[PDB]
Amino acid sequence: IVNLQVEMIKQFHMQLNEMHSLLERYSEGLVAEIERLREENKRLRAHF
Amino acid sequence: FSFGDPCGDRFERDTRVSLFGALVHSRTYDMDVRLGLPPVPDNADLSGLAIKVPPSV
Fold first, then answer.
1. Do A46 and B34 touch (CB under 8 A)?
2. CA pair distance A26, A7, nearest whole angstrom
3. For residues A48 and B36, what is the distance between their CA atoms, to the nearest angstrom?
4. How far apart are CA B26 and CA B34, in angstroms?
5. CA distance B39 to chain A (A)
6. What is the rounded CA–CA span in Å between residue A34 and residue B9?
7. Are B30 and A44 in contact (CB under 8 A)?
Protein backbone atom coordinates (compact mmCIF):
# COMPACT_ATOMS: atom_id res chain seq x y z
CA ILE A 1 0.00 0.00 0.00
CA VAL A 2 2.86 2.39 0.83
CA ASN A 3 4.59 1.61 -2.47
CA LEU A 4 1.29 2.14 -4.29
CA GLN A 5 0.76 5.45 -2.48
CA VAL A 6 4.25 6.74 -3.30
CA GLU A 7 3.97 5.68 -6.94
CA MET A 8 0.50 7.24 -7.16
CA ILE A 9 1.75 10.51 -5.68
CA LYS A 10 4.63 10.62 -8.16
CA GLN A 11 2.28 9.82 -11.05
CA PHE A 12 -0.20 12.46 -9.84
CA HIS A 13 2.58 15.05 -9.73
CA MET A 14 3.81 14.11 -13.21
CA GLN A 15 0.25 14.15 -14.59
CA LEU A 16 -0.45 17.54 -12.99
CA ASN A 17 2.70 18.95 -14.57
CA GLU A 18 1.79 17.45 -17.95
CA MET A 19 -1.73 18.91 -17.74
CA HIS A 20 -0.30 22.31 -16.82
CA SER A 21 2.05 22.13 -19.80
CA LEU A 22 -0.75 21.02 -22.13
CA LEU A 23 -2.99 23.86 -20.98
CA GLU A 24 -0.15 26.35 -21.44
CA ARG A 25 0.43 24.96 -24.94
CA TYR A 26 -3.27 24.94 -25.84
CA SER A 27 -4.45 28.14 -24.13
CA GLU A 28 1.44 35.04 -29.43
CA GLY A 29 -1.24 34.42 -32.04
CA LEU A 30 -3.04 37.63 -31.08
CA VAL A 31 0.20 39.62 -31.30
CA ALA A 32 1.03 38.16 -34.72
CA GLU A 33 -2.49 38.85 -36.01
CA ILE A 34 -2.30 42.43 -34.73
CA GLU A 35 1.10 42.88 -36.39
CA ARG A 36 -0.16 41.41 -39.67
CA LEU A 37 -3.24 43.65 -39.72
CA ARG A 38 -1.08 46.67 -38.84
CA GLU A 39 1.31 45.81 -41.67
CA GLU A 40 -1.68 45.43 -44.00
CA ASN A 41 -3.18 48.78 -43.00
CA LYS A 42 0.18 50.57 -43.29
CA ARG A 43 0.70 49.01 -46.73
CA LEU A 44 -2.80 50.07 -47.79
CA ARG A 45 -2.25 53.64 -46.57
CA ALA A 46 1.17 53.95 -48.22
CA HIS A 47 -0.09 52.48 -51.51
CA PHE A 48 -3.15 54.72 -51.44
CA PHE B 1 -7.83 61.75 -77.29
CA SER B 2 -6.76 60.17 -73.99
CA PHE B 3 -3.41 60.07 -72.28
CA GLY B 4 -2.74 56.51 -73.43
CA ASP B 5 -2.56 53.91 -70.68
CA PRO B 6 1.12 53.23 -69.88
CA CYS B 7 0.61 49.47 -70.07
CA GLY B 8 3.31 48.96 -72.71
CA ASP B 9 6.62 50.55 -71.75
CA ARG B 10 8.06 49.74 -68.34
CA PHE B 11 9.38 53.30 -68.18
CA GLU B 12 5.93 54.61 -69.12
CA ARG B 13 4.32 52.15 -66.70
CA ASP B 14 6.47 53.35 -63.80
CA THR B 15 5.79 56.96 -64.81
CA ARG B 16 2.04 56.29 -64.70
CA VAL B 17 2.03 54.41 -61.41
CA SER B 18 4.43 57.00 -59.99
CA LEU B 19 2.47 59.82 -61.70
CA PHE B 20 5.46 60.82 -63.84
CA GLY B 21 7.62 60.04 -60.82
CA ALA B 22 5.47 62.04 -58.40
CA LEU B 23 4.67 59.00 -56.28
CA VAL B 24 7.53 58.05 -53.97
CA HIS B 25 6.53 54.92 -52.07
CA SER B 26 3.28 54.07 -53.88
CA ARG B 27 2.25 52.82 -57.30
CA THR B 28 -1.32 52.97 -58.55
CA TYR B 29 -3.39 52.42 -61.65
CA ASP B 30 -6.45 53.99 -60.00
CA MET B 31 -6.95 57.69 -60.70
CA ASP B 32 -9.36 58.08 -57.75
CA VAL B 33 -6.93 56.81 -55.09
CA ARG B 34 -6.73 58.99 -51.99
CA LEU B 35 -2.99 59.45 -51.53
CA GLY B 36 -1.73 58.33 -48.14
CA LEU B 37 1.75 57.87 -46.69
CA PRO B 38 2.92 54.83 -44.70
CA PRO B 39 1.97 55.18 -41.03
CA VAL B 40 4.55 56.26 -38.45
CA PRO B 41 6.12 53.11 -36.96
CA ASP B 42 5.14 52.39 -33.37
CA ASN B 43 8.80 52.11 -32.35
CA ALA B 44 9.70 55.59 -33.62
CA ASP B 45 9.17 57.00 -30.13
CA LEU B 46 11.13 54.00 -28.78
CA SER B 47 13.79 53.25 -31.42
CA GLY B 48 13.92 56.57 -33.23
CA LEU B 49 13.36 57.18 -36.92
CA ALA B 50 15.30 54.87 -39.22
CA ILE B 51 16.09 55.76 -42.81
CA LYS B 52 13.90 53.38 -44.80
CA VAL B 53 16.18 51.42 -47.13
CA PRO B 54 14.35 50.43 -50.33
CA PRO B 55 14.11 46.64 -50.54
CA SER B 56 16.73 45.18 -52.86
CA VAL B 57 13.98 43.26 -54.67
1. no
2. 28
3. 5
4. 11
5. 5
6. 39
7. no
Residues of chain A contacting B25 with CB distance shorter than 8 Å:
46
Q: Which helix (H) or strand (E) holds B46?
A: helix B44-47
Distance CA B45, CA B43 (A): 5
- In a 13 Å sphere around the CA of B26, the CA atoms on its Cβ side amount to 21
Q: Please give, rounded to a whole number of angstroms, the shortest distance from the CA of B30 to a CA of chain A.
A: 9
Collect all residues of chain B within an 8 Å Cβ-Cβ radius of residue A35: none
Method of determination used here: cryo-EM
In a mutagenesis test of the A interface, which of B17, B24, B25, B26 is the best target, namely the one with the most A β-carbons within 10 Å?
A: B26
The DSSP code sequence of A1-48 is: -HHHHHHHHHHHHHHHHHHHHHHHHH--HHHHHHHHHHHHHHHHHHH-
